[PDB]
């Protein structure tokens, strides 16, 4: 798989709530087959995507699913590590819902660096993802470091957290959990 530039990772996955860049979403993905009590991952089922000319990363992932050649008789967990509020863009949650309804052999996990609580459409997109069966949670230090170790061209250098990473993660998590509470 192609590995992400490290400054691109740090700039986009920064979870500082006071920084609200309005351009890009990065989505690191992995597909795991769940079988016999373990998880089986293929390097060819791993990589990252960004928004490209108005087509958002989430939809670009849906676009590549046929190329993954998933066995409909098996169970897969798809994990997204996404740098922006999932399905922020218009109509995105509805397209993910349709995909999940048409592919019941796929379970979607979404780990988000942040969310965008607008007490409106972007907040409702989060509930739509949950209602469609996705498991949505906030990235913690564990996920940021895993993404650094796994998807980034790091040259063996260790993950260096930014100031406030944990404080920001816990605050965002509290809000996401309130939004998705049942
Ligand atoms: Cl969470």
Curated annotation (Swiss-Prot):
It is found in: Nucleus. GO terms for biological process: clearance of foreign intracellular DNA; cytidine to uridine editing; defense response to virus; DNA cytosine deamination; innate immune response; negative regulation of single stranded viral RNA replication via double stranded DNA intermediate; transposable element silencing. The active site is at residue 58. Induction: Phorbol 12-myristate 13-acetate (PMA) induces overexpression in keratinocytes. Up-regulated by IFN-alpha. Signal peptide: none annotated. Its main location: nucleus. It comes from the Eukaryota. Residues 21-129 form the CMP/dCMP-type deaminase domain. The keyword Aminoacyl-tRNA synthetase does not apply. GO terms for cellular component: cytoplasm; nucleoplasm; nucleus; P-body. Expressed at high and moderate levels in peripheral blood leukocytes, spleen, testes, heart, thymus, prostate and ovary. Also expressed at low levels in several other tissues. Keywords: Antiviral defense, Hydrolase, Immunity, Innate immunity, Metal-binding, Nucleus, Repeat, RNA-binding, Zinc. Zn(2+) binds at residues 56, 87, 92. GO terms for molecular function: cytidine deaminase activity; RNA binding; zinc ion binding. Homodimer. Interacts with APOBEC3G. Does not interact with APOBEC1. It is one of seven related genes or pseudogenes found in a cluster, thought to result from gene duplication, on chromosome 22. The CMP/dCMP deaminase domain 1 mediates RNA binding, RNA-dependent oligomerization and virion incorporation whereas the CMP/dCMP deaminase domain 2 confers deoxycytidine deaminase activity and substrate sequence specificity. Belongs to the cytidine and deoxycytidylate deaminase family. DNA deaminase (cytidine deaminase) which acts as an inhibitor of retrovirus replication and retrotransposon mobility via deaminase-dependent and -independent mechanisms. After the penetration of retroviral nucleocapsids into target cells of infection and the initiation of reverse transcription, it can induce the conversion of cytosine to uracil in the minus-sense single-strand viral DNA, leading to G-to-A hypermutations in the subsequent plus-strand viral DNA. This is DNA dC->dU-editing enzyme APOBEC-3B. The gene is APOBEC3B.
């Amino acid at each position: 798989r192609y590995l992400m530039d490290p400054d691109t990772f740090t700039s986009n996955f920064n979870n500082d709530p006071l920084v609200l860049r309005r351009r890009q979403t990065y989505l690191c993905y992995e597909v795991e087959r769940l079988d016999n009590g373990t998880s089986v991952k293929m390097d060819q089922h791993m990589g990252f995507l960004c928004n490209e000319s108005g087509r958002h990363a989430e939809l670009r992932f849906l676009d590549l699913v046929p190329s993954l050649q998933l066995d409909p008789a098996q169970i897969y967990r798809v994990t997204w590590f996404i740098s922006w509020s999932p399905c922020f863009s218009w109509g995105c949650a509805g397209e993910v819902r349709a995909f999940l309804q048409e592919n019941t052999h796929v379970r979607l996990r979404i780990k988000a660096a942040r969310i965008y609580d607008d007490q409106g459409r972007c907040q409702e997109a989060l509930q739509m993802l949950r209602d469609a069966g996705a498991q949505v949670s906030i990235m913690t230090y564990d996920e940021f470091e895993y993404c650094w170790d796994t998807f980034v061209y790091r040259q063996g250098c260790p993950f260096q957290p930014w100031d406030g990473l944990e404080e920001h993660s816990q605050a965002l998590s509290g809000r996401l959990r309130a939004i998705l509470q049942l």
